[PDB]
Amino acid sequence: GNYNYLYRLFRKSNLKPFERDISTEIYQAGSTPCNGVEGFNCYFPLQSYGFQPTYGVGYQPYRVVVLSFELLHAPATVCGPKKSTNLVKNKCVNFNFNG
Amino acid sequence: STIEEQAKTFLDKFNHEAEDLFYQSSLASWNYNTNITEENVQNMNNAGDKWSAFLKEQSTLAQMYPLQEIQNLTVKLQLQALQQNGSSVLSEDKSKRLNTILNTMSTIYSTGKVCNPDNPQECLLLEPGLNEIMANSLDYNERLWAWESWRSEVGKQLRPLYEEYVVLKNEMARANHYEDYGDYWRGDYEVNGVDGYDYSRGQLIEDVEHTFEEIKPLYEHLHAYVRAKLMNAYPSYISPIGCLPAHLLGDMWGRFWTNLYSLTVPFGQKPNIDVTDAMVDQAWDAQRIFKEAEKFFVSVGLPNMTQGFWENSMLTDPGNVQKAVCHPTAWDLGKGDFRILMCTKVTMDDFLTAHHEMGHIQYDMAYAAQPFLLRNGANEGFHEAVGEIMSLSAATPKHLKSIGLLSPDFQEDNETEINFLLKQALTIVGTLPFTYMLEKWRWMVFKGEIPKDQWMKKWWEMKREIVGVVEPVPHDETYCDPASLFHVSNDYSFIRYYTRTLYQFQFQEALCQAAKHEGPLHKCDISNSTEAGQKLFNMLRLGKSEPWTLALENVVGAKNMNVRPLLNYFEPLFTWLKDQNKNSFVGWSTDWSPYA
Numbered sequence: 257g258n259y260n261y262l263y264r265l266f267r268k269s270n271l272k273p274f275e276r277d278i279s280t281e282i283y284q285a286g287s288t289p290c291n292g293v294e295g296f297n298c299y300f301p302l303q304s305y306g307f308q309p310t311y312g313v314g315y316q317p318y319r320v321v322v323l324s325f326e327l328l329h330a331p332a333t334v335c336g337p338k339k340s341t342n343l344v345k346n347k348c349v350n351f352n353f354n355g
Numbered sequence: 356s357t358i359e360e361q362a363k364t365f366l367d368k369f370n371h372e373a374e375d376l377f378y379q380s381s382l383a384s385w386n387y388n389t390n391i392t393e394e395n396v397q398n399m400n401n402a403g404d405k406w407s408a409f410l411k412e413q414s415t416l417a418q419m420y421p422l423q424e425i426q427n428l429t430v431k432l433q434l435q436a437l438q439q440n441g442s443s444v445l446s447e448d449k450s451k452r453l454n455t456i457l458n459t460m461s462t463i464y465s466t467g468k469v470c471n472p473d474n475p476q477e478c479l480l481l482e483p484g485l486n487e488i489m490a491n492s493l494d495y496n497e498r499l500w501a502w503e504s505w506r507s508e509v510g511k512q513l514r515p516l517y518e519e520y521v522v523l524k525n526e527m528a529r530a531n532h533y534e535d536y537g538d539y540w541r542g543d544y545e546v547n548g549v550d551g552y553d554y555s556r557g558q559l560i561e562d563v564e565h566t567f568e569e570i571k572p573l574y575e576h577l578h579a580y581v582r583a584k585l586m587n588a589y590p591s592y593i594s595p596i597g598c599l600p601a602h603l604l605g606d607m608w609g610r611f612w613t614n615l616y617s618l619t620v621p622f623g624q625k626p627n628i629d630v631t632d633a634m635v636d637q638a639w640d641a642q643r644i645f646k647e648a649e650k651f652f653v654s655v656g657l658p659n660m661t662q663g664f665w666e667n668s669m670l671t672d673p674g675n676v677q678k679a680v681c682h683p684t685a686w687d688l689g690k691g692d693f694r695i696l697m698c699t700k701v702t703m704d705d706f707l708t709a710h711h712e713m714g715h716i717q718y719d720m721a722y723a724a725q726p727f728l729l730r731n732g733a734n735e736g737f738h739e740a741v742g743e744i745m746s747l748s749a750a751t752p753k754h755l756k757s758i759g760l761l762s763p764d765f766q767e768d769n770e771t772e773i774n775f776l777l778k779q780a781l782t783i784v785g786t787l788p789f790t791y792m793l794e795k796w797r798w799m800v801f802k803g804e805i806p807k808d809q810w811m812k813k814w815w816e817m818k819r820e821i822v823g824v825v826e827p828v829p830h831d832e833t834y835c836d837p838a839s840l841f842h843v844s845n846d847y848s849f850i851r852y853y854t855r856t857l858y859q860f861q862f863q864e865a866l867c868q869a870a871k872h873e874g875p876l877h878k879c880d881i882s883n884s885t886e887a888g889q890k891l892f893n894m895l896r897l898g899k900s901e902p903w904t905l906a907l908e909n910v911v912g913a914k915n916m917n918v919r920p921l922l923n924y925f926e927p928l929f930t931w932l933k934d935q936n937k938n939s940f941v942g943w944s945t946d947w948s949p950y951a
């Protein structure tokens with residue numbers, strides 16, 4: 257059982273976009289103060305996953321990479337690989353050299 | 356903030372942690388079942404103790420949230436399920452005594468060995484040593500010896516234990532705000548809070564009697580026919596006017612009558628529908644059997660088995676070196692892990708069992724979307740019933756011809772249908788009076804209607820009145836004849852078989868009406884019908900979220916268990932039995948006329 261992966265189970269409010277929450281404070285679900293001890297109505301918000309190789313496809317671990325593309329007023333430098341057609345000489349061709 | 360949100364967060368935490376703990380416990384149990392070794396036993400015991408302690412701690416936390424301030428039906432159902440004390444309400448001494456009594460009854464039943472006096476050097480275990488003798492012997496005194504000796508040893512050991520057991524269970528049940536332990540068992544079918552679809556604990560006994568009154572003529576005709584055939588087999592023991600001798604029913608306790616098919620066959624001259632030889636000739640492996648079952652389930656529109664099912668299940672006997680339990684069992688380990696543990700042979704029985712267990716797996720898969728504490732059947736009847744409908748559908752000659760296991764030129768006449776229906780009646784109809792009598796007797800014992808000194812005098816009186824089976828010799832109060840059965844000795848409910856039997860034919864009629872089958876009910880096959888699978892999956896996906904009455908409305912359109920589909924299923928056989936019983940006398944006498 258691989259318990260090295262954690263997820264937040266309870267929070268008072270929903271997360272904002274592109275927010276990371278690494279707080280490990282006891283979640284207060286009730287009016288009573290937690291006082292830092294996990295008792296009644298007070299739960300630790302981070303819970304471990306229990307990945308095993310004999311699990312179903314809906315419970316098996318999936319690695320997710322999300323790529324976010326933004327354009328800002330700064331010069332854009334992450335560009336795609338512009339392909340290069342082989343050079344042909346001595347003929348009337350339409351040339352595009354570095355824009 | 357509010358009580359409902361607090362309960363919802365607590366239920367989320369319970370579901371998430373309980374699912375992983377249940378997986379660990381179930382995996383330990385699986386490792387014990389596929390590998391019987393002492394370390395696996397220790398790991399299973401440790402996991403079970405952790406699971407029970409966790410359930411106790413969660414129930415203790417759960418009770419602090421009052422039920423009446425929660426309006427959501429699902430949340431209230433989960434809180435009701437979790438807040439049961441179980442044995443925790445009882446004192447620690449009495450709880451420990453009850454646990455010790457249950458464990459020692461389990462050891463006595465499992466390791467009970469009985470053999471003939473004057474030859475005690477080796478003895479036979481009931482699971483194969485005596486089952487084969489009870490199912491295949493034709494000798495009167497040998498069967499009488501086995502039956503009386505096993506009931507003598509087991510009953511004389513278990514009678515004080517059962518006397519303590521009834522008092523302790525009644526004390527726990529009255530401590531849990533129930534009338535008796537019977538009311539505690541009947542609380543499974545109790546629906547509260549739904550408008551119109553409420554069902555009461557008191558209504559179950561009345562419904563069972565009402566259905567059994569309609570069961571009684573068909574059972575009387577079947578009993579008369581079986582009595583006449585057993586009279587042919589044994590000339591002088593069986594009386595024309597009396598009950599059947601107890602040790603001649605083909606099984607150890609009278610649970611099923613399916614071992615009397617050879618003696619009571621209507622048309623022996625006609626061939627059987629046995630497909631064992633066809634699989635042997637084509638070398639059908641158990642993997643092929645499960646693939647054909649999967650093909651059946653995808654034909655009706657249900658989802659196919661996962662890759663983890665094929666990878667992790669044990670569908671063949673491991674070998675001499677590794678020990679495993681031979682009983683077929685479907686395991687819902689949790690987290691989408693579904694396995695079948697069966698020592699599959701090349702037989703028709705194993706093929707039907709494979710369909711039944713894969714039906715159990717399909718039922719388990721359907722409610723995977725539900726919360727953990729609601730991942731069960733709506734009642735105990737539905738879970739077995741959805742496997743039994745597959746057992747009904749797979750056994751048809753149309754299914755065997757469709758998959759190529761039967762010759763396409765086999766003549767399906769009325770005589771083969773009559774003998775097949777009689778075999779299905781011996782398996783299915785015969786268990787109903789025994790089940791009803793046993794549950795009613797246990798309910799009267801728990802309720803206090805029968806005093807401890809009068810348990811057996813009433814019990815045999817019930818068996819003559821209901822089952823139509825007479826004792827070979829009278830038994831006094833030193834015997835404990837009910838507790839020789841597996842379910843009653845190990846604290847299991849027995850009404851699930853009765854409810855399963857009625858729900859089986861109700862579901863069968865509903866799916867056949869969905870599939871637009873236009874012939875007899877027993878000639879119906881539910882393959883190739885997407886709409887029947889959709890109608891089944893609508894109930895299957897709910898799990899325990901909805902009441903069983905609403906689920907039954909979803910499938911058959913009725914708010915209560917019904918007996919008419921069973922009578923419709925056996926109607927050709929019912930007419931044939933009525934025709935054949937003109938000379939003979941239908942019904943039995945409760946007197947000691949055959950033997951006592």
Ligand SMILES: *[C@@H]1O[C@H](CO)[C@@H](O)[C@H](O)[C@H]1NC(C)=O
Nearest residue numbers: 386389390391392673677678
């Ligand atoms: C069964 O248990 C034995 C005893 O430790 C072990 O050697 C073997 O690998 C186990 N087999 C399986 C399939 O777990």
Ligand SMILES: *[C@@H]1O[C@H](CO)[C@@H](O)[C@H](O)[C@H]1NC(C)=O
Nearest residue numbers: 363366426427428429430726
């Ligand atoms: C009950 O609670 C579940 C989640 O716990 C929610 O999905 C469902 O909609 C609720 N039902 C009602 C009627 O509010």
Ligand SMILES: *[C@@H]1O[C@H](CO)[C@@H](O)[C@H](O)[C@H]1NC(C)=O
Nearest residue numbers: 418438439440444530531532
């Ligand atoms: C469980 O037992 C405790 C103590 O005996 C009791 O206060 C509580 O009401 C019980 N819960 C139920 C549901 O009976």
Ligand SMILES: *[C@@H]1O[C@H](CO)[C@@H](O)[C@H](O)[C@H]1NC(C)=O
Nearest residue numbers: 653658659660661662663665
């Ligand atoms: C189940 O069915 C899908 C599509 O019908 C198929 O792709 C998948 O391989 C099947 N699963 C298995 C274990 O064969």
Ligand SMILES: *[C@@H]1O[C@H](CO)[C@@H](O)[C@H](O)[C@H]1NC(C)=O
Nearest residue numbers: 621622768769770771773931
């Ligand atoms: C089967 O049908 C034939 C033809 O009608 C009839 O003579 C025979 O009695 C029937 N057998 C049974 C058992 O009903």
Ligand SMILES: *[C@@H]1O[C@H](CO)[C@@H](O)[C@H](O)[C@H]1NC(C)=O
Nearest residue numbers: 654753757758880882883884
């Ligand atoms: C059900 O569908 C399968 C797959 O197409 C087919 O082989 C089978 O013959 C069908 N059943 C009948 C009774 O035609």
